[PDB]
Amino acid sequence: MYKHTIVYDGEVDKISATVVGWGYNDGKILICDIKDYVPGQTQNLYVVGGGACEKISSITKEKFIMIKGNDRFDTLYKALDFINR
Amino acid sequence: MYKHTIVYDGEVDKISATVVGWGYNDGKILICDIKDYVPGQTQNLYVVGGGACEKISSITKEKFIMIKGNDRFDTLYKALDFINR
């Protein structure tokens, strides 16, 4: 169903998650809160921000890439770095 | 009356406008689409993105600061720079 799914927890980390999705235009992408994440329907899973990174392993067995800093700003810079922007 | 109002045009410049809002916790803040902007109820006006920056002068006669780059990423970095992050 999706090529890239980017998960976050909360309206702050949503920003960073959204910017990670700005790095991809090669397929269908889903940006969604961890509380709405449905496992098993994505090729790639990216988890953004500390909150989502602590909860994700209890929600899915899929492999994933973590994008996380110490605060909302650091996370945002790491997101930008991850997509080479 | 709002201490800070941040205006944007569209869901992409919304993201940078949200980031500018992360820089302010000293007062009441409105983040809103340029279509919904109501002049005369803010101490500080900040206009995010090329879209809003072209429409705003025909909507209000208030002074404002422009936060805009050539693409969405440039706009986002300028948002971060505007709040010293």
DSSP structure string for chain B: -EEEEEEESSHHHHHHHHHHHHT--SS-EEEEEGGG--TTSEEEEEEESHHHHHHGGGT--S--EEE--SSHHHHHHHHHHHTT-
Interface test with A, best of B15, B24, B48, B83 (most A CBs within 10 A): B15
Which residues have CB under 8 Å from A36's CB, separation 6+? none
What resolution in Å is listed for this PDB structure? Answer: 2.2
Is B14 part of the contact surface with chain A (CB cutoff 8 Å)?
Answer: no
> Are B3 and B26 in contact, with CB atoms under 8 Å apart?
yes
Q: What phi and psi values does residue B78 have, to the nearest 5 degrees?
A: -70, -35
> Are B64 and B32 in contact, with CB atoms under 8 Å apart?
no
Domain boundaries, chain B: 1-85
Is A76 part of the contact surface with chain B (CB cutoff 8 Å)?
Answer: yes
A-to-B residue pairs, Cβ atoms closer than 8 angstroms: 18
Is B72 part of the contact surface with chain A (CB cutoff 8 Å)?
Answer: yes
| Number of CB atoms found within 10 A of residue A65's CB | 12
- Contacts B76 to A, Cβ<8 Å: 19, 80
Using DSSP's 3-state secondary structure scheme, residue A78 falls into: helix
CATH for A1-85 is 3.40.50.12090
Burial grade of A74 (CB within 10 A; 0-12, 13-18, 19 or more) = middle
Interface test with A, best of B6, B18, B84 (most A CBs within 10 A): B18
A71 vs A15: CA distance, rounded Å: 13
Strand partners, A65: A46
As given in the structure block, the two tokens for residue B50 are 């090329």
Burial grade of B34 (CB within 10 A; 0-12, 13-18, 19 or more) = buried
B48 vs B28: CA distance, rounded Å: 18
